[PDB]
Design a binder for this molecule. Structure first.
Ligand SMILES: Nc1ncnc2c1ncn2[C@@H]1O[C@H](COP(=O)(O)OP(=O)(O)NP(=O)(O)O)[C@@H](O)[C@H]1O
Ligand SMILES: Nc1ncnc2c1ncn2[C@@H]1O[C@H](COP(=O)(O)OP(=O)(O)NP(=O)(O)O)[C@@H](O)[C@H]1O
Ligand SMILES: [Mg+2]
Ligand SMILES: [Mg+2]
Ligand SMILES: [Mg+2]
Ligand SMILES: [Mg+2]
Lengths: 220, 220
């Protein structure tokens, strides 16, 4: 199963979702994380730096915290400029064949990598925020997804109350809402998944429920 | 500079010392960590698993938390038996030339990998706990150190009180003592160096003073 996390707007929580969903899924299924953002947010979130080599897509990977992380690298930049959507899509599918779950983190744009990951995805996951630009982006995702007739699952981040938009037929808003929490800030500073930092940091973990609900709603 | 962490007694703190000293050094100098224990304590402390491949010594490495970590692998086993001591020594020097600091974790024994790491070390560090068996271990470590024309710095772990011993001349006894702290246990649970975890977990990190003392004493 290929799960791609998409949002045109930056800072909405794409990397956090990819990191924690892949970490949650790796608890009982063989999971990989493909960092298609050239800036390597997910790579940094697993304690690594983006590779200063032009690697082919999917070549280099490290098993960290039971997730097979494919670190971001400068080669992606080239693909972001010259890449063929068909070729990149096929490579992503060949990569996904080795995992029960391949979570793909994508850049905050509508570029080649994001479009390829969005096209090959079995599940498309988008976080929405109370911020205005995220609302514009969720409506744009609904329109462009309407065109090729694919669906996404939207959940809410940076909020205690769900954000839902009316007359977006291609975007299923779940009831999941992830409130502001400096657990995420501390875990990202440390360079580990927040789901993993939580098991040590607090007595009663609370973030595991969000990602269990996400995996629940998207699975099969 | 090559720093080798040595103790034949198990569970005294070899891996904690290797992991945290290499991490501390990584803040200012190009630092690597060479895991020469086939059970891979340092590797696990950097969120990884020992490789189920018989690798040549020093081939695989991952930059985790700014440390170039050479994960343990099953190929160490063969090298423990049939490893040419001079070959292994030259390979370790070969590896360490690329770093300002190469911290080396060793198994709890006297075998070929450990003894090579002792031979080509610029500094050897030994943690001693106030347990009864640890004193015999530091004793016979002095016997080992004289037999190879080498000398080592000793500090105390799991204690507010320093351990020193009068009789042994190849073992310089520092005043450095590291008290029992639940930070190390929480960090091993996480699979990160305790220094990094502490720098994210509390307002005023305080474990770094011990490893600063260690760096100061071993670099004079
Ligand atoms: N619910 C939350 N509460 C508090 N901080 C959060 C939350 N979710 C995410 N963050 C933090 O907000 C920052 C940005 O989140 P991030 O996951 O990088 O979004 P992003 O979409 O990947 N940014 P980008 O890849 O550049 O488009 C990170 O430092 C996260 O740790
Ligand atoms: N000062 C300390 N306070 C509390 N726990 C500690 C302290 N130092 C080490 N530990 C813990 O003690 C355990 C054993 O330490 P470790 O660093 O693995 O020693 P070791 O010599 O490498 N074990 P081994 O490779 O089998 O000989 C680990 O779980 C550490 O986190
Ligand atoms: Mg990101
Ligand atoms: Mg592997
Ligand atoms: Mg050890
Ligand atoms: Mg490298």
């Amino acid at each position: 199963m290929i799960v791609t996390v998409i949002n045109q707007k930056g800072g909405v929580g794409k990397t956090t979702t990819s990191v924690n969903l892949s970490y949650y899924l790796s608890k009982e299924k063989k999971t990989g994380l493909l960092d298609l953002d050239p800036e390597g947010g997910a790579t940094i979130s697993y304690g690594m730096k983006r590779e200063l080599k032009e690697l082919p897509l999917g070549e280099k990977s490290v098993n960290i915290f039971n997730v097979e992380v494919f670190p971001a690298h400068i080669g992606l930049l080239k693909l972001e400029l010259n890449g063929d959507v068909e070729e990149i899509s096929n490579k992503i599918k060949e990569i996904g064949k080795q995992f029960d779950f391949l979570v793909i983190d994508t850049p905050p744009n509508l570029g080649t990598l994001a479009i390829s990951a969005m096209l090959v995805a079995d599940r498309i996951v988008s976080p929405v925020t109370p911020q205005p630009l995220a609302l514009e982006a969720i409506k744009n995702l609904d329109s462009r997804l309407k065109s090729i007739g694919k669906n996404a699952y939207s959940f809410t981040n940076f909020s205690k109350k769900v954000v839902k938009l009316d007359n977006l037929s291609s975007v299923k808003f779940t009831e999941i809402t992830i409130p502001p929490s400096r657990l995420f800030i501390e875990a990202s500073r440390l360079g580990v998944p927040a789901l993993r930092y939580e098991e040590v940091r607090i007595k009663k973990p609370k973030l595991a429920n969000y990602y269990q609900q996400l995996a629940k709603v998207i699975s099969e």
